[PDB]
Amino acid sequence: QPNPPDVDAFLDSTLVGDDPALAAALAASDAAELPRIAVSAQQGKFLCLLAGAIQARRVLEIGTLGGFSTIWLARGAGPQGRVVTLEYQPKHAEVARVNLQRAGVADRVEVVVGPALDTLPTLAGGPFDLVFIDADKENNVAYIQWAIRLARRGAVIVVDNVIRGGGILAESDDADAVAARRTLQMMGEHPGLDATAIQTVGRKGWDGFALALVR
Amino acid sequence: QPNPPDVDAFLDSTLVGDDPALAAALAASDAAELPRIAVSAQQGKFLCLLAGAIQARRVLEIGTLGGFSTIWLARGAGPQGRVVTLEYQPKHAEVARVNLQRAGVADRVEVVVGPALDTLPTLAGGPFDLVFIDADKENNVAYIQWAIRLARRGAVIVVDNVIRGGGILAESDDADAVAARRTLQMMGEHPGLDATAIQTVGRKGWDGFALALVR
Lengths: 215, 215
Fold this sequence. Notes:
2 copies of one chain form a homodimer. Chain A is of the alpha/beta class. Helix content of chain A is 44%, strand content 22%. The first copy, chain A, has a single domain, classed as 3-Layer(aba) Sandwich (Rossmann fold), CATH 3.40.50. Chain A has 9 helices and 7 strands; from the N terminus they run αααβαβαβαβαβααββ. Chain A is globular and about 40 Å long. Chains A and B meet through helix 1, helix 3, helix 8, helix 9 and strand 6 of A and helix 1, helix 3, helix 8, strand 6 and strand 7 of B. Chains A, B: Pfam families: Methyltransf_3. Chains A, B: It comes from Mycobacterium tuberculosis (strain ATCC 25618 / H37Rv). Chains A, B: S-adenosyl-L-methionine binds at residues 39, 61, 63-64, 69, 87, 116, 136.
């Protein structure tokens, strides 16, 4: 009987528990018709613990998607940390701001509105410790080149949804699956990166994330 | 129909490539009838990148299992890093030492032979930055308590195989599934830890790992 969504409900109850600020962010994102949140609670808390493990003080997020991922990163970056998150749609940006205010981390977060390919070149404040990429996968090759350019040596880059239910193997038909396949090929062959990819299951289905160190 | 083992062969080719030292460690472990290695190449490289990301200098591994996991950790800890790895069986310990010598990391690794509950109290190679636990699940609660005791604040603990194909949900037959369920509930209620669990698929099947920060 047991399937990965059922295991994730057990893991959420056991390791995350009641988190009204996250519940409210997911509800508000549904009401405003954002795209689906990219990370499960377990995957989001992974990003939180990764940020804490490396003592991330400056985090770049490409794809705010309602700020569920952003809340986790801002919690992990801690009282002194700062997250810069890039959102395309101003309405989506406003949803994220309210979700961040309700979670008590709006002071750690700057939401930067506009197409990421136009706003990435305009970022200052200095190099990032951690870059998280989870929207607009057609532009992943450009986002990864920008991530490398904006990140310190030894920084972590995480790219969400690089597996697409195994579509990356046999689906030339699907632009989405092709774009995920292309981001893996780019991360593997880039001499500025050392990269792995973890296939995941749970409440977000069969997918996975790439994780790289900047050399 | 793409499946996770097929996706992992593509991920291994793209992100890991030919690694004769690792191939030889897996072959020698099979010949000497060790238990199955706990981590895939992608999961092993994850441990490598995690060690590099946190700048691990002192790594504790509980369950050498032929030293596949250990080679990844020793590569990630770098030339200045030290790995202490605990193996129960002397024959298994000898396989691991040869695999470590062939991978050129023997000087970074001390294999400590005996029951982990007898050797853990004797370790002075800490405090540890990173603890990896992948053997003898029935003793996981004790291993995690020892991990916390021997680890610095902010240290990472990773516990392999905490999902068991979903067996942790209706597990009565299986000592392993029972033990995995107990390790999740212990990690979730421990005030000295913050913990998540990532469900994985790929060449090692449907399982997962817990990742915790030591508070």
